Short mmCIF file of C-alpha atoms and ligand atoms in Angstrom, two decimals:
data_model
loop_
_atom_site.label_atom_id
_atom_site.label_comp_id
_atom_site.label_asym_id
_atom_site.label_seq_id
_atom_site.Cartn_x
_atom_site.Cartn_y
_atom_site.Cartn_z
CA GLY A 1 0.00 0.00 0.00
CA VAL A 2 0.96 3.61 -0.30
CA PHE A 3 0.19 6.06 2.55
CA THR A 4 0.56 9.74 1.70
CA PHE A 5 0.99 12.68 4.06
CA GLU A 6 1.44 16.38 3.44
CA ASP A 7 3.16 19.05 5.48
CA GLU A 8 4.49 22.62 5.26
CA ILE A 9 7.41 24.55 6.70
CA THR A 10 8.54 28.16 6.16
CA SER A 11 11.83 29.92 5.68
CA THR A 12 12.99 33.52 5.39
CA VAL A 13 15.41 32.42 2.68
CA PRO A 14 14.06 32.80 -0.87
CA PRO A 15 13.43 29.56 -2.83
CA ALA A 16 16.16 29.84 -5.52
CA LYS A 17 18.81 30.32 -2.85
CA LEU A 18 17.40 27.59 -0.61
CA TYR A 19 17.12 25.15 -3.47
CA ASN A 20 20.73 25.65 -4.53
CA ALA A 21 21.83 24.94 -0.98
CA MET A 22 19.57 21.84 -0.89
CA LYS A 23 21.49 20.46 -3.84
CA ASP A 24 24.56 20.43 -1.55
CA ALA A 25 22.86 18.63 1.34
CA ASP A 26 25.44 15.75 1.21
CA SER A 27 28.22 18.11 2.14
CA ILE A 28 26.11 20.37 4.43
CA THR A 29 24.30 17.90 6.71
CA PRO A 30 27.36 16.01 8.16
CA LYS A 31 28.70 19.45 9.22
CA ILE A 32 25.56 20.95 10.85
CA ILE A 33 23.64 17.87 12.11
CA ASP A 34 25.64 16.27 14.92
CA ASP A 35 24.21 12.72 14.39
CA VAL A 36 25.11 12.73 10.68
CA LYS A 37 28.74 11.71 10.09
CA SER A 38 28.99 11.26 6.36
CA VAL A 39 27.09 10.89 3.12
CA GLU A 40 28.72 8.93 0.36
CA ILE A 41 27.60 8.18 -3.12
CA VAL A 42 27.71 4.39 -3.68
CA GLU A 43 26.08 4.36 -7.20
CA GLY A 44 25.39 7.05 -9.90
CA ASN A 45 26.54 10.69 -10.33
CA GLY A 46 24.05 12.55 -8.05
CA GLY A 47 21.10 12.41 -10.53
CA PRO A 48 17.94 10.17 -10.39
CA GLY A 49 18.78 6.56 -9.42
CA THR A 50 21.80 7.70 -7.47
CA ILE A 51 22.24 5.71 -4.28
CA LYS A 52 23.74 7.31 -1.16
CA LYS A 53 24.98 5.85 2.11
CA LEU A 54 24.48 7.94 5.17
CA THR A 55 26.37 7.10 8.32
CA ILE A 56 24.54 8.16 11.41
CA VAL A 57 25.16 7.97 15.09
CA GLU A 58 22.20 7.24 17.35
CA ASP A 59 22.50 6.43 21.12
CA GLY A 60 26.24 5.90 20.73
CA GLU A 61 25.66 3.31 18.01
CA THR A 62 26.69 3.79 14.41
CA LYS A 63 24.02 3.00 11.75
CA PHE A 64 23.64 3.42 8.10
CA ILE A 65 20.80 4.73 5.95
CA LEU A 66 20.38 4.24 2.19
CA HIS A 67 18.79 6.96 0.06
CA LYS A 68 17.88 6.86 -3.60
CA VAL A 69 17.48 10.06 -5.57
CA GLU A 70 14.04 9.83 -7.17
CA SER A 71 13.84 13.03 -9.15
CA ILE A 72 15.28 16.46 -9.56
CA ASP A 73 13.12 19.23 -10.92
CA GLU A 74 15.17 22.43 -10.95
CA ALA A 75 12.46 24.32 -12.79
CA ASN A 76 10.07 23.60 -9.93
CA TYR A 77 12.55 23.70 -7.03
CA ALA A 78 11.80 20.06 -6.37
CA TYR A 79 13.94 17.40 -4.82
CA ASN A 80 12.69 13.86 -4.27
CA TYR A 81 14.50 11.04 -2.51
CA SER A 82 13.54 7.75 -0.87
CA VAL A 83 14.74 5.82 2.10
CA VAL A 84 15.48 2.40 0.62
CA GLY A 85 17.51 0.64 3.34
CA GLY A 86 19.06 0.72 6.82
CA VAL A 87 17.70 1.85 10.19
CA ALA A 88 15.37 4.56 8.86
CA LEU A 89 13.44 1.71 6.93
CA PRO A 90 11.14 -0.50 9.01
CA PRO A 91 10.85 -4.18 8.00
CA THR A 92 7.16 -3.75 7.08
CA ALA A 93 8.08 -0.93 4.68
CA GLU A 94 9.23 -1.28 1.06
CA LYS A 95 10.39 2.30 1.05
CA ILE A 96 9.66 5.79 2.25
CA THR A 97 9.71 8.69 -0.21
CA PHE A 98 10.31 12.29 0.84
CA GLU A 99 9.21 14.91 -1.66
CA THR A 100 10.27 18.49 -1.20
CA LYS A 101 9.09 21.37 -3.33
CA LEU A 102 9.80 25.04 -2.66
CA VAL A 103 7.50 27.86 -3.65
CA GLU A 104 7.84 31.58 -2.93
CA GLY A 105 6.61 32.82 0.43
CA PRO A 106 4.37 35.90 0.59
CA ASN A 107 7.29 38.07 1.94
CA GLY A 108 10.11 36.97 -0.34
CA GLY A 109 10.76 33.88 1.81
CA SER A 110 9.94 30.22 1.13
CA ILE A 111 7.34 27.63 1.78
CA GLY A 112 8.61 24.07 1.79
CA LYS A 113 5.86 21.62 0.70
CA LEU A 114 6.59 18.21 1.99
CA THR A 115 5.01 15.03 0.78
CA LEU A 116 5.78 11.80 2.48
CA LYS A 117 4.87 8.57 0.68
CA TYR A 118 5.14 5.51 2.82
CA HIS A 119 5.15 2.32 0.77
CA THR A 120 4.17 -0.70 2.84
CA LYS A 121 4.39 -4.42 2.05
CA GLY A 122 0.99 -5.96 1.55
CA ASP A 123 -1.67 -4.78 4.02
CA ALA A 124 0.85 -3.49 6.57
CA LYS A 125 0.24 0.01 7.89
CA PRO A 126 2.84 2.56 8.78
CA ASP A 127 4.36 2.46 12.29
CA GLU A 128 3.43 5.70 13.97
CA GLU A 129 6.76 5.97 15.83
CA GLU A 130 8.70 5.58 12.62
CA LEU A 131 6.37 8.15 11.13
CA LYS A 132 7.05 10.76 13.81
CA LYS A 133 10.76 10.26 13.31
CA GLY A 134 10.34 10.70 9.59
CA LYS A 135 8.31 13.89 9.58
CA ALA A 136 10.83 15.25 12.08
CA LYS A 137 13.66 14.33 9.75
CA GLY A 138 11.59 16.13 7.10
CA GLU A 139 12.11 19.35 9.01
CA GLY A 140 15.45 18.80 10.66
CA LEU A 141 17.00 18.80 7.18
CA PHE A 142 15.15 21.83 6.04
CA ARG A 143 16.45 23.65 9.08
CA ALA A 144 19.97 22.48 8.50
CA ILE A 145 20.00 23.80 5.01
CA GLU A 146 18.37 27.04 6.04
CA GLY A 147 20.75 27.55 8.96
CA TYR A 148 23.72 26.95 6.73
CA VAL A 149 22.46 29.54 4.25
CA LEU A 150 21.80 32.17 6.89
CA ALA A 151 25.19 31.49 8.53
CA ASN A 152 27.06 31.73 5.22
CA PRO A 153 25.27 34.48 3.31
CA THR A 154 27.92 34.96 0.59
CA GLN A 155 27.82 31.26 -0.38
CA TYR A 156 24.49 31.41 -2.11
O1 28E B 201 17.84 15.99 12.19
C1 28E B 201 18.25 15.02 11.31
C2 28E B 201 18.68 13.81 11.82
C3 28E B 201 19.09 12.83 10.94
O2 28E B 201 19.50 11.65 11.47
C4 28E B 201 19.07 13.05 9.56
C5 28E B 201 18.65 14.25 9.03
C6 28E B 201 18.23 15.24 9.92
O3 28E B 201 18.66 14.46 7.65
C7 28E B 201 19.66 13.75 6.90
C8 28E B 201 19.71 13.94 5.43
C9 28E B 201 18.51 14.02 4.73
C10 28E B 201 18.51 14.17 3.35
C11 28E B 201 19.70 14.21 2.64
O4 28E B 201 19.67 14.36 1.27
C12 28E B 201 20.90 14.11 3.31
O5 28E B 201 22.03 14.17 2.50
C13 28E B 201 20.92 13.97 4.72
C14 28E B 201 19.20 12.31 7.15
O6 28E B 201 17.81 12.15 6.80
C15 28E B 201 19.51 11.96 8.61
O1 28E B 202 16.87 1.27 -6.94
C1 28E B 202 17.28 0.64 -5.79
C2 28E B 202 16.37 0.07 -4.89
C3 28E B 202 16.84 -0.55 -3.72
O2 28E B 202 15.93 -1.10 -2.86
C4 28E B 202 18.21 -0.62 -3.44
C5 28E B 202 19.10 -0.04 -4.34
C6 28E B 202 18.65 0.57 -5.50
O3 28E B 202 20.44 -0.07 -4.12
C7 28E B 202 20.99 -0.27 -2.81
C8 28E B 202 22.49 -0.35 -2.86
C9 28E B 202 23.25 -0.56 -1.69
C10 28E B 202 24.65 -0.61 -1.74
C11 28E B 202 25.29 -0.44 -2.97
O4 28E B 202 26.64 -0.47 -3.12
C12 28E B 202 24.56 -0.23 -4.11
O5 28E B 202 25.23 -0.07 -5.29
C13 28E B 202 23.17 -0.17 -4.06
C14 28E B 202 20.28 -1.50 -2.25
O6 28E B 202 20.62 -2.58 -3.14
C15 28E B 202 18.75 -1.29 -2.19
NA1 NA B 203 27.84 15.74 12.02
#
């Protein structure tokens, strides 16, 4: 089954600037997010199909997460990626897709439109705990990118 959820988050940063920084999330997030230690490309060049290995630290234990780049839509400020393996993927789940799209905020800032698609195996339903962790991670990244941009204004 596929379970779909929608959410919104705002930023002072304008969408073109925030999107360009999002494209560099692999190099940004290990720096700003304490739990994230590294992001390595295992397959592809960074485009759709590209597989990344994230090394994370949680409760003093090292764990890995696998992401697949689903789509990149520069024209629409859209970045889509799925969790396809590791600790962030419950056994019931086939995969979890995170869709981000930026649109202009009323005051020159940004609205981040988040879509979460949780793909279950069979008639399994999503784990709520895993879900809370996801949606959080949906923000915690957005904030990382935004904080980086605000802290390094020349960069973008
Ligand atoms: O607050 C967090 C905590 C995390 O463990 C993670 C967060 C944010 O975002 C990371 C992240 C998310 C998306 C990326 O494209 C990426 O390179 C890194 C990852 O989901 C792991
Ligand atoms: O398109 C996919 C879908 C998956 O479920 C996976 C994909 C790619 O690749 C992962 C993967 C994991 C480690 C690798 O070195 C590698 O090249 C690919 C894993 O097999 C799980
Ligand atoms: Na870190």
